[PDB]
């Protein structure tokens, strides 16, 4: 179990850790989150009491170093930072625990939710989507645009998701125009899986990462990317059996976890109705179809 101390909490903010969150008052003596499960990525995020726009946060993995949060009054936000002095860091963490100024990451033992939502998310892959190689953790916010969004303006701050485009030369083999547009299996399996992602786990990892950024930050281009990578699978007639079964599990826990009040902007009606009901794989997402029908029958 690992710990992310906070130097102080100078401004009123709502802090999230993974799917949990806490209200912290201006200069409340809050000094960190302990008992963070080792073995998964995590995300700490913020929403200031005074600006319910720009949700922001940091992806990290505690095996990669000792990380902590500090409010910067110049840039006006909570910043993640690494402590290189391991002794000095255990020292802070112990004193803050001794004084019990830390919240405990509130995992129910029965609950596999976070694992289910991050099964395939690797910290190394995140740092290739969010390129800032001097830090071991990754900053994301509501407003960051994707590389594909940009093509249709600042690259240092872009989400470098894999570009998927159903009407591109990449996607369509000359001479198989109709075949390949109607049946995306060659784009999925040859171009994306074997070519770019190399295997299904990296593909699933980007898909889950994109979902999480749409959920926690309302990042629109991430939503766009989640739905594209769903649609590519569902619009392919030939998909490995293990991927369909895993996809059905992946989506189930994503739909289960989504705030009910947000299904209007996070769920693209066309894509879901096509995936669940018209696509090649209409019959291969039984769990995802059952939770969608019982929880959001309006969108359908």
């Amino acid at each position: 179990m690992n710990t992310v101390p906070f130097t102080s909490a100078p401004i009123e903010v709502t802090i999230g850790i993974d799917q949990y969150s806490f209200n912290v008052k201006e200069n409340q003596p809050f000094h960190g989150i302990k008992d963070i499960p080792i073995g998964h990525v995590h995300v700490i995020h913020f929403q200031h009491a005074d600006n319910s726009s720009m949700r922001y946060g940091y992806w990290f993995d505690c095996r990669m170093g000792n990380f902590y949060i500090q409010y910067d009054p110049k840039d006006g936000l909570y910043k993640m930072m690494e402590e290189r002095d391991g002794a000095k860091f255990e020292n802070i963490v112990h004193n803050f625990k001794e004084r019990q100024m830390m919240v405990s990451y509130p995992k129910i033992d029965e609950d596999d939710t976070w694992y289910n939502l991050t099964e395939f998310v690797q910290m190394d892959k995140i740092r290739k989507i969010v390129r800032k190689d001097e830090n071991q953790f990754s900053y994301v916010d509501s407003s960051m645009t994707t590389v594909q969004e940009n093509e249709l303006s600042d690259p240092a701050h872009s989400l470098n998701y894999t570009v998927i485009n159903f009407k591109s030369r990449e996607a369509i083999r000359p001479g198989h125009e109709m075949e390949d547009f109607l049946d995306k299996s060659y784009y999925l399996n040859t171009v994306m899986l074997q070519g770019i992602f190399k295997n299904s786990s990296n593909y699933f990892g980007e898909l889950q990462f994109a979902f999480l950024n749409a959920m926690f930050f309302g990042n629109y281009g991430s939503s766009l990317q989640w739905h594209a990578m769903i649609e590519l699978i569902c619009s392919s007639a030939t998909v490995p059996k293990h991927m369909l079964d895993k996809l059905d599990e992946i989506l189930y826990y994503q739909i289960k976890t989504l705030p009910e009040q947000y299904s209007d902007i996070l769920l693209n009606e066309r894509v879901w109705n096509i995936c669940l009901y018209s696509s090649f794989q209409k019959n291969s997402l039984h769990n995802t179809e059952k939770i969608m029908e019982n929880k959001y029958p309006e969108l359908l």
């Binding site: 009407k167 591109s168 030369r169 369509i172 125009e177 109709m178 547009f181």
Partner: protein, 237 residues
Amino acid sequence: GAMNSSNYAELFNNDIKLFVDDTNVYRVTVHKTFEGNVATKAINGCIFTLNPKTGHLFLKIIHTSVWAGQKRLSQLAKWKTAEEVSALVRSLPKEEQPKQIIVTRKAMLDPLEVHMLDFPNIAIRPTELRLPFSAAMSIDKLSDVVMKATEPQMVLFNIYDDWLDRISSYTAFSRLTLLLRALKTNEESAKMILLSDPTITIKSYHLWPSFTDEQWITIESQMRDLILTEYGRKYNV
């Protein structure tokens, strides 16, 4: 964006553009089988691809053999239209390739877009106009060459005959679309009107009769009258 009443004169500027109509590509007769089931028989069709400014018509005839052994023919028809239009563009010298292709039915957008991926600077547009080009097979000479064809075949025509020697492309297109609208709404009357007078003939190299200017005015008035009557009949107005 979409072509509509507002941006109509764009059709006659000097940017090359083609209309593509696929309504007569996949053509069938429906009949009863010996066991009493229904079946279709395909007949020959055509892609109507037309430069509205110059009158040049690129009539690609679709021979019934194209369908042999294929399923979902109405969907395939759309892609074969897009294949053939894309081939036509490739076959034209660069300076002759269109800058825009306007499809008359929105279902052609995706097929044509996908087939023109090699031509990203050719814009593929839909239209809100209700153009009557489906009546193209009401023009005797076009129907004849389509139905006689024994193999795929591209036949070129000028759909305005020599009208442009005396009238603008705007006026020529308005005449074309009036004539075709009439033929669509009531072929028999429309055809009667065009041929009632045996002394006004069709040039071997033309599609329509060699009306004088004054006679075109009478013709057009008669077609307008035809169209209005049929409306009242349709809607009991």
